[PDB]
């Protein structure tokens, strides 16, 4: 979506919730798993799929609740609905956006920026390796603003 | 470039130095200061640029000496050449990679993969905040293929 800050650091599970509560939507511990479950997710399920896979641990789950969860994730803009040719089916993905923080060398001050990259590597490196990715803590060092118009320092942090 | 694994973790940096390594390319201090410099662009630079860019911190540094070392990048595959018109200035994109290590949660084995998008993170992160990116530090976690289900 368009740049903005939440004024600090949250990745992609972290940041829809962040988003869901700024929208007053209630946060149930089954919305909670079929976020997660999109994230982790490295293909692009249907809403069947993503029903039978979460069935087991939500016996009291439904096809209706995967759609209304779905719902609110595309509106939202966290999820995208796929097509391939002749399927009628459709197929969801997680691209949702995370924050990470910058942090300068000299003076430690921190600014955030908004990412959609990480879930790129998050996707290279399950393919890669087939480990089954559960997190990737990223942070930024650089030399903020101020301290690029200031002298050398003679140490640093 | 294809996908591939040196057996271990290596920044953009330490990358193309692995790979002139093995093709027993010569690594000068000349070499090493444009590669860096390389990959901490945020822009396209001509020639005249990088050489006006570097020689206050590298004296030594002449055009002659840019040119040979990006022919040499161009070459291997690291940099690729952009023209715009006919006069003699060429731009020039760093066209890099790294390698990460994915960690499992569980047993600690390590794994590495060829990324191309951390690179693209520090575009992003100085174009948002004004920051000179210096570095970003990667290590990816998991569950590896043993320890799953
Ligand atoms: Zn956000
Ligand atoms: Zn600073
Ligand atoms: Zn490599
Ligand atoms: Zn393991």
Do not use: W
């Amino acid at each position: 979506m368009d740049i903005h800050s939440h004024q600090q650091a949250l990745d992609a599970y972290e940041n829809v919730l962040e988003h869901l509560r700024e929208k007053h939507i209630r946060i149930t511990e089954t919305r909670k798993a079929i976020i997660s479950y999109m994230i982790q997710s490295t293909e692009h399920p249907s809403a069947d799929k993503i029903y039978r896979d979460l069935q087991p641990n939500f016996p009291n789950m439904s096809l209706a609740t995967v759609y209304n969860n779905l719902k609110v994730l595309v509106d939202e803009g966290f999820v995208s609905e796929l097509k391939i040719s002749n399927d009628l089916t459709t197929y969801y993905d997680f691209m949702g956006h995370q924050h990470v923080n910058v942090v300068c060398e000299i003076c430690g001050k921190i600014a955030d920026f908004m990412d959609v990259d990480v879930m790129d590597i998050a996707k290279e490196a399950h393919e890669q390796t087939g480990y089954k990715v559960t997190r990737i803590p990223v942070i930024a060092y650089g030399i903020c603003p101020d301290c690029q118009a200031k002298d050398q320092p003679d140490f640093l942090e």
